[PDB]
Design an enzyme around this catalytic site. Structure first.
Site, PDB file in Angstrom:
ATOM      1  CG  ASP A 104     -17.065   1.407  19.126  1.00 48.84           C
ATOM      2  OD1 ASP A 104     -17.694   0.418  18.682  1.00 48.84           O
ATOM      3  OD2 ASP A 104     -16.429   2.194  18.397  1.00 48.84           O
TER       4      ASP A 104
ATOM      5  CG  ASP B 285     -19.081   1.913  12.116  1.00 53.01           C
ATOM      6  OD1 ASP B 285     -19.563   2.746  12.907  1.00 53.01           O
ATOM      7  OD2 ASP B 285     -17.930   1.458  12.248  1.00 53.01           O
TER       8      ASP B 285
HETATM    9  N1  X8Y Z   1      -4.341   2.736  14.520  1.00 53.02           N
HETATM   10  N2  X8Y Z   1      -4.997   3.826  13.892  1.00 53.02           N
HETATM   11  N3  X8Y Z   1      -4.885   3.736  12.435  1.00 53.02           N
HETATM   12  C1  X8Y Z   1      -6.137   3.772  11.716  1.00 53.02           C
HETATM   13  C2  X8Y Z   1      -6.810   4.986  11.404  1.00 53.02           C
HETATM   14  C3  X8Y Z   1      -8.053   4.965  10.703  1.00 53.02           C
HETATM   15  C4  X8Y Z   1      -8.606   3.732  10.333  1.00 53.02           C
HETATM   16  N4  X8Y Z   1      -9.910   3.648   9.623  1.00 53.02           N
HETATM   17  C5  X8Y Z   1     -11.121   4.000  10.431  1.00 53.02           C
HETATM   18  C6  X8Y Z   1     -12.397   3.182  10.076  1.00 53.02           C
HETATM   19  C7  X8Y Z   1     -13.722   4.033  10.116  1.00 53.02           C
HETATM   20  C8  X8Y Z   1     -14.875   3.253  10.788  1.00 53.02           C
HETATM   21  C9  X8Y Z   1     -14.354   2.821  12.180  1.00 53.02           C
HETATM   22  C10 X8Y Z   1     -15.364   2.274  13.215  1.00 53.02           C
HETATM   23  N5  X8Y Z   1     -16.072   3.375  13.869  1.00 53.02           N
HETATM   24  C11 X8Y Z   1     -16.143   2.989  15.292  1.00 53.02           C
HETATM   25  C12 X8Y Z   1     -15.280   4.011  16.061  1.00 53.02           C
HETATM   26  C13 X8Y Z   1     -15.751   5.459  15.822  1.00 53.02           C
HETATM   27  O1  X8Y Z   1     -15.552   5.815  14.478  1.00 53.02           O
HETATM   28  C14 X8Y Z   1     -14.916   6.397  16.722  1.00 53.02           C
HETATM   29  O2  X8Y Z   1     -14.615   5.733  17.901  1.00 53.02           O
HETATM   30  C15 X8Y Z   1     -17.226   5.604  16.148  1.00 53.02           C
HETATM   31  O3  X8Y Z   1     -17.664   6.859  15.674  1.00 53.02           O
HETATM   32  C16 X8Y Z   1     -18.113   4.521  15.496  1.00 53.02           C
HETATM   33  O4  X8Y Z   1     -19.365   4.615  16.065  1.00 53.02           O
HETATM   34  C17 X8Y Z   1     -17.570   3.092  15.785  1.00 53.02           C
HETATM   35  O5  X8Y Z   1     -18.361   2.130  15.130  1.00 53.02           O
HETATM   36  C18 X8Y Z   1      -7.936   2.525  10.661  1.00 53.02           C
HETATM   37  N6  X8Y Z   1      -8.521   1.207  10.295  1.00 53.02           N
HETATM   38  O6  X8Y Z   1      -7.688   0.072  10.098  1.00 53.02           O
HETATM   39  O7  X8Y Z   1      -9.924   1.114  10.162  1.00 53.02           O
HETATM   40  C19 X8Y Z   1      -6.694   2.560  11.356  1.00 53.02           C
END
Ligand code: X8Y
Ligand code: CA
Ligand code: CA
EC number: 3.2.1.207
Lengths: 84, 854
Positions: B452, B528
């Site tokens: 990913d 997502d």
């Molecule tokens: N550095 N740190 N600080 C931070 C902390 C939190 C933050 N927001 C999160 C965004 C939510 C959606 C993320 C994408 N999901 C990925 C990864 C994943 O969620 C898990 O790997 C899988 O489940 C999914 O399938 C994939 O698509 C941010 N930030 O800038 O977005 C920075």
């Protein structure tokens, strides 16, 4: 020598169609020892612990479901007895 | 989504410059004195009439009815990028000869015809013909633009707060193509947009730049996680494909004009390298493209089952409870997934010491249930002097670097992180060796991988990705290579799973970013999505557009990634996901738990039913994937692929086909009482696989539905193989007998194939240990023969049942097998449905046999 019926009354079959690995009774009663019927059950005698029933689909699936290991008799998985 | 984060075309300086060139007389002209016909190609010099910049056009006729056009500078200051590792081979050429000439024209013949290419000298132009029919023109709108490397925001440029030093200045290339008679185009994923591509004349071009877009929205042309620069044109008369082989940021404009569609590609750097795939049928295009970039990798059988995932399962105990929950609730599942919280503070290849202290015991518990596990491994490495992976990569200089020579550092899940340079093969070899059971401690043969964030995602980077001026192996800039960074990750990971087995086991790797050729390395998904009905709907056009360009192993998060789906929505998403190639439920960290047994029984029972339908069709799913692997034909198909002359199918995207046998129209509206099913085909019949009712094409059928309905129809003339004994996972089922479903054509005929092997090794190719069976029905006889005699397999699989739709009651049924006496079989017949069931044929699937109805 007589033939076999079915616990639901859905037909009657010759005694060679009991545990012949094809499902002939709507209730699955003709295949208690195989995986052929979707709604059948296999009886684990399990001497030394509780006797248990499992789904027909778990007979010879390679997974040990009875503690006595008798659900796996022709699958390549040998189950040790674990009813202790 | 917050759109201000991502450039529009106006905010991309090379896009702005290119798009400002409007259709008109081109200043490029071909110097026919310089013309040379070489062993492999024709080379002629091009010149800009105003700047007198000299280009070289390398024109090639190719075997399998394709042309390749390449344009580069004659004497460039420094070399331009040419995309490596995507083509599976050097494409075999066909000889070109001059068959016509005048002072402004040279006509060339590919081999002995019927394909011809007319090179016009002034203005520069290319026309491709079959005989005297014009197929396609190049530069007909005069939009060719080639910014040569000037002597060292056209140069240094800023966006938001991020600065591009842009040391080589403006270098973009662009070219236009004219498609006479074409009104529909498809392809160039990834976009959350309709299957039939829209005209871009009044809005944004389609953008191809692998990007991490948070909470992306529907029906817009913003670039998403992957980019496949392939466009397909379809009409009643022909099919064509354009393959623009460029790895830099690319924008695509589409305009319609007797009907005609024009396509213009605009790329930041590299050379012009485009393949014109001349068909004439869409399956000819599939083959043409497959010969260039390869075919779908054959998935191990387990990866075509159901995957249960979320962000995140808590610990080993949680994983084993999920495993037990499937079995206690009589629901099949093959793989449980482990997201980023399973590792030590997002240091990949590690395990949290408290929550996953004994990973081998966890995997051993899953192996005894005959189930697998997937662990996530992202390509960003936490900058941490106690992290062994980071120390090795830093000590061996394998990181992406900045112009000053220090290793690039950005921000992602573990905080400050560096990015391995996956364009460097030494780095890829390192990565692959890291998956050996000695290096990846706690891994075992039933642990597989998820890549990913491999765009790469960089939280503090421009548009959430890497700086354009970072430097990779060989001195190339990041802007040169961007769209194949993810493919290199996927490839190196997949090769690692092969290597750790000694080359025997097939890999499984899921990847978010992708490019042309990614089909060779596993699966992809649409990133997502969100728990909403329109996101459920859009999974079809998104995976369909990936199917058309070679990526058959596609899917979307079942349930939606963001937010909590309502129970009716979750049920419909399962029924939809059960008939799509990659079948995984996944969910965001802050969502409620939605393992399928946590719903009320009515929702549970419908979900169980959808899972059972999926597991029973695995023999069918596996064969389509073998056909995709051998031939390049997509598994999930738009209706217009199977009915190319039915113009009402060209835009359909609430329906799809699996191979040529199953038509699927899932319910995608809350509280629906029915669906409108378009059944195509003149003198075609379709069987409702739930009611066995026969329907005559072409029509639009109103089908009432309940919560349990999955509207599925089988085409007459097809034979579908099923495992009717659903067990807890595919490993448990793969020695079980097959039931054959014969849907009789109006002429009383039918056919289908069946592929079989051990389910997970490469023995099918290194030892030809497999079976390919062809089943045929005609007259009143079903015959099993070999569709490939090279294939042999030791297998207990037998034919336990034959179900025939559209048949009358026979008087007797007789089976003949080589090696056996002629046998009589008993049968049942429903005169209401014209369904005939042949009881227990008992014959081995490796044997030739025939059944006769008297
Ligand atoms: N550095 N740190 N600080 C931070 C902390 C939190 C933050 N927001 C999160 C965004 C939510 C959606 C993320 C994408 N999901 C990925 C990864 C994943 O969620 C898990 O790997 C899988 O489940 C999914 O399938 C994939 O698509 C941010 N930030 O800038 O977005 C920075
Ligand atoms: Ca029986
Ligand atoms: Ca068992």
């Amino acid at each position: 020598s007589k033939p076999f019926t079915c616990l639901d009354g859905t037909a009657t079959i010759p005694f060679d169609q009991v545990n012949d690995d094809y499902c002939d009774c709507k209730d699955g009663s003709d295949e208690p020892g195989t995986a052929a019927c979707p709604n059948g059950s296999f009886h684990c005698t399990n001497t030394g612990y509780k006797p248990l029933y499992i789904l027909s689909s778990r007979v010879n699936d390679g997974v040990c479901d009875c503690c006595d290991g008798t659900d796996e008799y022709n699958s390549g998985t040998v189950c040790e007895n674990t009813c202790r | 989504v917050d759109r201000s984060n991502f450039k529009t075309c106006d905010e991309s300086s090379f896009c702005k410059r290119q798009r400002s060139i409007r259709p008109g007389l081109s200043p490029y002209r071909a110097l026919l004195d310089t013309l040379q016909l070489g062993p492999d190609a024709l080379t002629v010099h091009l010149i800009h009439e105003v700047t007198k910049v000299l280009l070289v056009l390398e024109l090639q006729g190719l075997q399998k009815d394709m042309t390749r056009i390449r344009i580069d500078e004659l004497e460039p200051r420094r070399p331009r990028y040419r995309v490596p590792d995507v083509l599976v081979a050097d494409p075999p050429t066909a000889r070109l000869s001059v068959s016509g000439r005048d002072d402004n024209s040279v006509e060339l013949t590919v081999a002995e015809g019927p394909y011809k290419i007319i090179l016009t000298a002034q203005p520069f132009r290319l026309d491709l013909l079959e005989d005297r029919s014009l197929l396609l023109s190049v530069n007909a709108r005069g939009l060719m633009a080639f910014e040569h490397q000037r002597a060292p925001g056209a140069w240094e440029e800023t966006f938001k707060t991020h600065s591009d030093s842009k040391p080589y200045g403006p270098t973009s290339v662009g070219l236009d193509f004219s498609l006479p008679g074409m009104e529909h185009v498809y392809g160039i994923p990834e976009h959350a947009d309709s299957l039939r591509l829209k005209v871009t004349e009044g809005g944004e071009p389609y953008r191809l730049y692998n990007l991490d877009v948070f909470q992306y929205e529907l029906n817009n042309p913003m670039a998403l996680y992957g980019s496949v620069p392939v466009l397909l044109a379809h009409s009643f008369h022909r099919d064509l494909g354009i393959f623009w082989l460029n790895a830099a940021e690319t924008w695509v404009d589409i305009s319609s004009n007797t009907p005609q569609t024009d396509i213009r590609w605009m790329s930041e750097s590299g050379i012009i390298d485009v393949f014109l795939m001349l068909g004439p049928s869409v399956f000819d295009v599939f083959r043409q493209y497959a010969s260039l970039t390869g075919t779908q990798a054959l998935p191990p059988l387990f990866s075509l089952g159901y995957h249960q995932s979320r962000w995140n399962y808590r610990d080993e105990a949680d994983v084993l409870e999920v495993d037990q929950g499937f079995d206690d609730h009589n629901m099949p599942c093959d793989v449980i997934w482990l997201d980023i919280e399973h590792a030590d503070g997002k240091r990949y290849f590690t395990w949290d010491p408290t929550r996953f202290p004994q990973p081998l015991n966890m995997l051993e518990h899953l192996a005894s249930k005959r189930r697998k596990l997937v662990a996530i491994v992202d390509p960003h490495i936490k900058v941490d002097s106690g992290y062994r992976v980071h120390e090795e990569l830093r000590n061996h200089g394998l990181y992406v670097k900045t112009r000053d020579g220090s290793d690039y550092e950005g921000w992602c899940w573990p905080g400050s992180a560096s990015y391995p340079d996956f364009t460097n093969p030494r780095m890829r070899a390192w990565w692959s060796n890291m998956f050996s059971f000695d290096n990846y401690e706690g891994s075992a043969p039933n642990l597989y991988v998820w890549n990913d964030m491999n765009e790469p995602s960089v939280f503090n980077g421009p548009e959430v990705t890497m700086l354009k001026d970072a430097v990779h192996y060989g001195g190339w800039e990041h802007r040169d290579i961007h769209n194949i960074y993810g493919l290199y990750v996927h490839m190196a990971t997949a090769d690692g799973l092969i290597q750790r087995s000694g080359g025997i086991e097939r890999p499984f790797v899921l990847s978010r970013a992708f490019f042309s050729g990614s089909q060779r390395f596993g699966a992809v998904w649409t990133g997502d999505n969100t728990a909403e009905w329109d996101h459920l709907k859009i999974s079809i056009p998104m995976c369909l557009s990936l199917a058309l360009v070679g990526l058959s192993f596609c899917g979307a998060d079942v349930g939606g990634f963001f937010k909590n789906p309502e129970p009716e929505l979750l049920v419909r998403w399962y029924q939809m996901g059960a008939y799509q190639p990659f079948f995984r439920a996944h969910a965001h960290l802050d969502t409620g738990r939605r393992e399928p047994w946590l719903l009320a029984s009515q929702y549970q029972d419908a979900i169980r039913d959808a899972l059972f339908q999926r597991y029973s069709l695995l023999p069918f799913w596996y064969t389509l994937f073998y056909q995709a692997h051998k031939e390049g034909f997509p598994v999930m198909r738009p209706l217009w692929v199977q009915y190319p002359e039915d113009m009402s199918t060209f835009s359909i995207e609430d329906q799809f086909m699996l191979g040529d046998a199953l038509l699927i129209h899932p319910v995608s509206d809350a509280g629906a009482h029915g669906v409108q099913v378009y059944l195509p085909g003149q003198e075609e019949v379709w069987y409702d696989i739930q009611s066995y009712q026969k329907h005559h094409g072409p029509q639009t059928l109103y089908l009432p539905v309940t919560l349990s309905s999955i509207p599925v129809f089988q085409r007459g003339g097809t034979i579908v193989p099923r495992w009717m004994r659903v067990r807890r996972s595919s490993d448990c089922m793969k020695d079980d007998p097959i039931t054959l479903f014969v849907a009789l054509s109006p002429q009383g005929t039918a056919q289908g194939e069946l592929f079989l092997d051990d389910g997970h090794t490469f023995n099918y190719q290194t030892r030809h240990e497999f079976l390919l069976r062809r089943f045929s029905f005609s007259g009143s006889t079903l015959v099993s023969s070999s569709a490939d005699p090279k294939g042999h397999l030791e297998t207990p699989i037998w034919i336990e049942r034959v179900v025939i739709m559209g048949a009358g009651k026979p008087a007797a049924v007789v089976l003949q097998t080589k090696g056996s006496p002629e046998s009589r079989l008993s049968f049942q017949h429903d005169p209401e449905t014209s369904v005939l069931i042949l009881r227990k044929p008992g014959v081995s699937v490796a044997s030739d046999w025939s059944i006769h109805l008297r």
